[PDB]
């Protein structure tokens, strides 16, 4: 994506400002050219980037955190990649390195001396200080107006903690001048300096990363060891079973509101040219048998092997994870101490009709269920990943996109009241993907190209995945929009051909193609209405038809209706009667399931057995409120849900979906993963 612009890099040391000037000499000869600015701190760099003075910096996990907060909301545009044998990674392990032969365990660290990478840094500060507090060791039980975070000064006798401008005990083991021993860029900073601090005997432990012995002493690795959390010691190479955490790689932050394309163009180019095996001398990442610590980790960490572009949906919150974001938070802000599950579950509700239905559930339940609101499914999957909402019942297609994201199926929606439900329950039986047509017996399966189709929504089992999975296999073109003549598939780009037949809120202005019941044509019932009113095709499930037809839907569009007005389209070319599913469907597909973070999932499940005993379809207070009946159409739960089938503990979204449906939504998504699917693909790594 084209400029011919300068990118203003922000360096926070003069060593690093020399590797940056050597790099803009290495391609003054490109569309995208570099410029270098030097600031004392990365925090002078952050607001340098807030104001439009600078354009990039590769910040630690810890300082990507603070760059992502207001009044500058910089986001991660690329990440460092790292391994040896197995592949590449987007993360690293914080370790606590000790000398072989000293004899302290983790219990015994008090009145010891520590070498730190820096103040506010992951492996160096956040991981190990945060872990000491949590265990009991560092005694800090907040800043209400409690004096505080440098209470490590009390724990450690003296330390070397670069950036500390509060404590003196913390500046104490640092080599260098007087003014400059305790600077960020000072001699005992980074992984490599904190390692040297320990080599020297200026600390008893160094709070470093998993490659720090090997980049600094590959030669004398047998002389060092790791300090495990279980009150044992493990060898240098046993860090997979002896680390303190796994944090998000350092990553390049840049204004959201700007030129993230030129920075990635420069970076993409640079790396391709001056990468790991360059064809001679400028190396952007190059780290052998120890150099001088101040020479290490300039621009990018020496252990970085590539720079991986970060999907546009990612923020810092999402970038760091739920655990690490919240661990920063713990120590970084207030004592947040007796509210981990705040015993109300937050339901995620898509748009205003489900909100009102939810709100009623809250009332009625006596606030056992509480409610969150969002405009999309997509947006609701983000809140859950982020701990801002806890659960949502989703179509199987969204189950796939959610499981990719780390969320797990809790209860499967069963559409037999009847079959599978307790003792009764086996596995939520599967429904069927179907193609519905009207009167005209011209239209066939094999004649749809050019038709005027209708879809439940984009990325919905029945409404999109089966239909488009199937068409796409035929054609082998990622052209979806340009197959049908015009259509409705809410959540489609507004410009699309597939945003053409949507009618939004009534038609009454509001919102012509959103994926919510704010859109006229959203859901299974929404796209039958499209058939009836505009559509040529309706991609729906097997009972839609027989749910709204012969006096079942009492809407005016549906008023006249009968199942005689509809037929099904077979894949063989032929047609059939709606009341014939087993013999003429698009495919047999898994049900709708409620998903949650895996930690949350066993008290969601009892919440729901609780609520179902009361508001389910043989509920005790079902006169007060029936959970599975909607005042519009499907709202929270599909409207003819009979019960919620319990998934056994630790079931993955793949096992839930099965291999057929797993393989069709994988294969379809080889073409145009949505932004939430791209954030979550990235993050399977974390
Ligand atoms: C390309 C692809 O995803 N294929 C999937 C895979 O799960 C399976 O091997 C095959 C059926 O046996 O077709 C389907
Ligand atoms: C019905 C359907 O969508 N089938 C899918 C398809 O996307 C793909 O072609 C196949 C293996 O190639 O795996 C499955
Ligand atoms: C049984 C068949 O062979 C194996 C899978 O990889 C297939 O796609 C299918 O399930
Ligand atoms: Fe780091
Ligand atoms: Fe569905």
Coordinates of C-alpha atoms in Angstrom, one line a residue, residues 110-112 137-140 147-158 167 169-170:
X110 CA 14.6 -12.5 50.8
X111 CA 17.8 -10.5 51.6
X112 CA 19.3 -11.7 48.3
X137 CA 7.1 -12.9 49.9
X138 CA 6.8 -9.3 48.8
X139 CA 4.4 -7.8 51.3
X140 CA 2.5 -5.1 49.4
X147 CA 3.1 3.9 49.8
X148 CA 4.1 1.2 47.4
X149 CA 5.5 -0.7 44.4
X150 CA 9.2 -0.3 45.3
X151 CA 8.6 -2.5 48.4
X152 CA 11.0 -4.9 46.6
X153 CA 13.5 -2.5 48.1
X154 CA 12.3 -4.0 51.5
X155 CA 12.5 -7.6 50.2
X156 CA 15.8 -7.5 48.3
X157 CA 18.8 -6.1 50.3
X158 CA 20.0 -4.2 47.1
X167 CA 14.5 3.9 45.4
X169 CA 18.4 0.1 47.1
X170 CA 17.0 -0.7 43.6

